[PDB]
Write a protein that binds this ligand. Structure first.
Ligand SMILES: Nc1nc2c(ncn2[C@@H]2O[C@H](COP(=O)(O)OP(=O)(O)OP(=O)(O)O)[C@@H](O)[C@H]2O)c(=O)[nH]1
Ligand SMILES: Nc1nc2c(ncn2[C@@H]2O[C@H](COP(=O)(O)OP(=O)(O)OP(=O)(O)O)[C@@H](O)[C@H]2O)c(=O)[nH]1
Ligand SMILES: [Mg+2]
Ligand SMILES: [Mg+2]
Lengths: 141, 141
């Protein structure tokens, strides 16, 4: 069957609410069998420092986060996109607005103007599949 | 604020579960105030016979259904697309798979190959915003 490659930008893991739940805790692959929009097995990073050339996990994926309070994390976006574009392609199937149930955010929705490149998720309520089912882009790429 | 124009293909109305609920019953405009992915007011047809040049409600919309058991309704898709493309545009922001909790379907997921044009919804369970929030396409058109 169709087997989907998913490789997700300090609440990414969080998302992966696979295990239906809500989790201070190197690498996790995960495998579930859904149906999306009509038999689909799904196939989680840590963006801390150390991995940089282990990252080039950008090679084996099809579809590819910030915290709405963390502007430097908004600002980490631009370092990222570059090493998956340089999957020598200027268009990869690919923006995660996590931590949206919170009450003092430094990255304004407005500013996530995404549209230059080509969702606001709460891993704490479940406002987690609306971002992932990215599978739909895989499905037209 | 941003005011979104929405004009939806015998379970369309159904969808519009606006009123949070689940409904044998000419035209309904509807107005709700959400947030999608970061202040968004939302702005329902009957595809029976009579309206055809009243339809040309294709002029005042930005974003624009079948029943998974109804192949002739799958087959009504192609009549439709044409009069909103002829909004003299070959690319309009715009496929609804309704009646997906049921158990004998004549339109196979597989065949909704959508991808030529450019979701499977249950208005009976709530498997209703995943199709609509179409608003995201409006937002990059
Ligand atoms: N309130 C709130 N906290 C969250 C949410 N998602 C994650 N967190 C918290 O933020 C912290 C980090 O969550 P993790 O899932 O470990 O984050 P990380 O993104 O994995 O860090 P890297 O793996 O290096 O990218 C934890 O204490 C989480 O509970 C969310 O949506 N709401
Ligand atoms: N089981 C089931 N029946 C549904 C669903 N959605 C609609 N129906 C039923 O199908 C029938 C038609 O629903 P309506 O919402 O009136 O359908 P319609 O699409 O409005 O007809 P037009 O307005 O001419 O396009 C009703 O008896 C609904 O309850 C659904 O997802 N599940
Ligand atoms: Mg993580
Ligand atoms: Mg209807």
């Amino acid at each position: 069957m169709t087997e989907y490659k998913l490789v997700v930008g300090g609440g990414k893991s969080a998302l992966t609410q696979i295990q239906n739940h809500f989790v201070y805790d190197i690498e996790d692959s995960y495998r579930k069998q859904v149906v999306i929009d009509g038999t689909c097995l799904l196939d989680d990073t840590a963006g801390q420092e150390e991995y940089s050339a282990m990252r080039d996990y950008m090679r084996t994926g099809e579809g590819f986060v910030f915290a709405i309070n963390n502007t430097k994390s908004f600002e980490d976006i631009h370092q990222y996109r570059e090493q998956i574009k340089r999957k020598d392609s200027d268009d990869v199937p690919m923006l995660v607005g996590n931590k949206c149930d919170l009450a003092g955010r430094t990255v304004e929705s407005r500013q996530a103007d995404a549209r230059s490149y080509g969702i606001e998720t709460s891993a704490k309520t479940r406002q987690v599949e609306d971002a992932f089912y990215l599978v739909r882009e895989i499905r037209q790429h």
